[PDB]
Each structure stands twice: as structure tokens, then as C-alpha cells.
Design a protein around this ligand. Structure first.
Ligand SMILES: *[C@@H]1O[C@H](CO)[C@@H](O)[C@H](O)[C@H]1NC(C)=O
Ligand SMILES: *[C@@H]1O[C@H](CO)[C@@H](O)[C@H](O)[C@H]1NC(C)=O
Lengths: 97, 49, 48, 48, 48
């Protein structure tokens, strides 16, 4: 009993004092956050269009001269989603395991 | 406070406009969020934010 | 430390300052959403 | 409608500012062969 | 830059005899003008 009550005591003291104890769980929250922050950061890319902003194309070009620019942003943003969903699908398998 | 199709100076978009507390310095006209999307503007006629 | 749990982002905060300091309003505003787990942090504590 | 232009070698520049531009005047003129643009489409120039 | 010249500036009181102060502050813009010239060289101006 005294050895058990002491050991359950050290569990509190260890978790309370150290920074690292939950690192395996913090690393999941961090990877989930990082990938969403990256998927947002990707939206700022031109991919070779005259703007990263969809409205700044549609407010500067006509209904034909825009389509090539917009298709660049579609291709880049769609490949950004296929990357994210591949990362998260593969990651899911790690969490399942 | 209503959803609207705004244009300021050619910065076309869609949103609810609202009164800001962001301390824009006299030289500034737009303010941006992490995503590189505008989320504040100084109105070109009456210079409130 | 949690990057949200999908709870009640009813623009009472996500309109105003916190929309500038918190990444998660920018994620929301770009069509990325976080959804709650079925079992609450109280129900997992009950099963435990 | 400047009387005499500059030579291509010594090309002139004007700063145009603090004024309203109505490019539809220029585009609605028959006078031009050439009215070609590289980061905007001419009918949109008036909306901007 | 590319057919503009511009000035950024700040004022701060400090009590250091002959050295540039440890600390941090950033310079706000004060003017821009489109002089558009081949600058190479510069000098300062002062009074008795
Ligand atoms: C233009 O805007 C100013 C404020 O910047 C306003 O005082 C003025 O009345 C406006 N001009 C006219 C002709 O009303
Ligand atoms: C500016 O003038 C100097 C001195 O004649 C010359 O060496 C330099 O190449 C010039 N640069 C430009 C951009 O005209």
C-alpha cells in the first residue's frame, strides 16, 4: 500500500513538473494544426496566375482572359487539397494503429 | 452589419462590413489576415476603418 | 493545448479581435472546419 | 493630342494622378489600330 | 524602387552620451515621390 500510494504520488509530481510527458499527444495536435495552417498558406500562392486573389482576377479580366488564370488557381488549390487529404489519410492510419 | 457586395477602390468582394477598433496608422489603406485575405479597409471618402 | 474542439464559434468572438489573433477563424473563413468528437470530454471521463 | 511627340529613343513620361480616367473614351474611338493590354482587359478598365 | 523615392522616420528621446541605443523600434513612412533619376551619391546639410 505505501509503495503504491508513493508511486501514484510520483505520477502527479512527474506530470506536474515536466514539459515533455504528453509529447506523443501534443505532436498529433501540432501536426493537425500545421497541415491546416499550410493548407491556408497555400491559398496565397499565384501558381502562375496574375494574382493569388480570385476576385482580383475577376475584377481585372474579361470572361475569356480570366479562364486561363482561374484554371491555374483551380489546378494549384486542388493539388493542395489532394496533398492534404493524402497526408491526413496516411496519418489516419497511424492514429488507427 | 448586413451582407453586401462591396467594392472599395477595386478591392471587390462579399462580406458584412462592421466598425473597426484596429489602429491603422495614417499611411495605411488595407489590413490582412493570415490567409493573405483582406479583413479591414479605410473607406476612401470618410477615412474611418 | 488545443487548437479548438469544434465548439460554438458563433461570431460573438469570430467577429472582432480574436478573428485577427486566432488562426482558426482564418481557417473557418477559408472553408476549413473542425468538427466535435461524438463523445464529450465528460463522457470519456465517465467511461474511464 | 500633344502637337509634337518625342522620339522613341528619348521617350517622354507623364505622371497622371488625382484625376478620373475614362478609358471608354479612348476605347470607343475608332481612331486606333492598336489597343492591346497585358494585365487587365480594356472593358474592365472603367470598373477600377 | 522602380521610379519612386521614399522616406521612413522616427523620433525617440534617450540618455546616451555617444552611442546608438540597445532596444527596438520601427520607422513609419513619411513621404514618397516619383523622382525617377539615376542616383549614385549623397551628402548631408546643416547650419552654424
Ligand atoms: C468628399 O469627401 C470629403 C471627406 O473626405 C467630404 O467632406 C466632401 O464633402 C466630399 N466632397 C463633396 C463634393 O461633397
Ligand atoms: C548612373 O550614372 C553612372 C555615372 O555615369 C553610371 O556609372 C551608371 O551606370 C548609371 N546607371 C544608370 C541606371 O543609368
Amino acid at each position: 500500500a505505501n509503495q503504491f500510494n508513493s508511486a501514484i504520488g510520483k505520477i502527479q509530481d512527474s506530470l506536474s513538473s515536466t514539459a515533455s510527458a504528453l509529447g506523443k499527444l501534443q505532436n498529433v495536435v501540432n501536426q493537425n494544426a500545421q497541415a491546416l495552417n499550410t493548407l491556408v498558406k497555400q491559398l496565397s500562392s499565384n501558381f502562375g496566375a496574375i494574382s493569388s486573389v480570385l476576385n482580383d482576377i475577376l475584377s481585372r479580366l474579361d470572361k475569356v482572359e480570366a479562364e486561363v488564370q482561374i484554371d491555374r488557381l483551380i489546378t494549384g488549390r486542388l493539388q493542395s487539397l489532394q496533398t492534404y487529404v493524402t497526408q491526413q489519410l496516411i496519418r489516419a492510419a497511424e492514429i488507427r494503429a | 452589419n448586413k451582407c453586401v457586395n462591396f467594392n472599395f477602390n477595386g478591392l471587390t468582394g462579399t462580406g458584412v462590413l462592421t466598425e473597426s477598433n484596429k489602429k491603422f496608422l495614417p499611411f495605411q489603406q488595407f489590413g490582412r489576415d493570415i490567409a493573405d485575405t483582406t479583413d479591414a479597409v479605410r473607406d476612401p471618402q470618410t477615412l474611418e476603418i | 493545448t488545443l487548437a479548438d474542439a469544434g465548439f460554438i464559434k458563433q461570431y460573438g468572438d469570430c467577429l472582432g479581435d480574436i478573428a485577427a489573433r486566432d488562426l482558426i477563424c482564418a481557417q473557418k473563413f477559408n472553408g476549413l472546419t473542425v468538427l466535435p468528437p461524438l463523445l464529450t470530454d465528460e463522457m470519456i471521463a465517465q467511461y474511464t | 493630342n500633344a502637337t509634337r511627340f518625342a522620339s522613341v529613343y528619348a521617350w517622354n513620361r507623364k505622371r497622371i494622378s488625382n484625376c478620373v480616367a475614362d478609358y471608354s473614351v479612348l476605347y470607343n474611338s475608332a481612331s486606333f489600330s492598336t489597343f492591346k493590354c497585358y494585365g487587365v482587359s480594356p472593358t474592365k478598365l472603367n470598373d477600377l | 524602387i522602380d521610379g519612386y523615392f521614399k522616406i521612413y522616420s522616427k523620433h525617440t528621446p534617450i540618455n546616451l552620451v555617444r552611442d546608438l541605443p540597445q532596444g527596438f523600434s520601427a520607422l513609419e513612412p513619411l513621404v514618397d515621390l516619383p523622382i525617377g533619376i539615376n542616383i549614385t551619391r549623397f551628402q548631408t546639410l546643416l547650419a552654424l
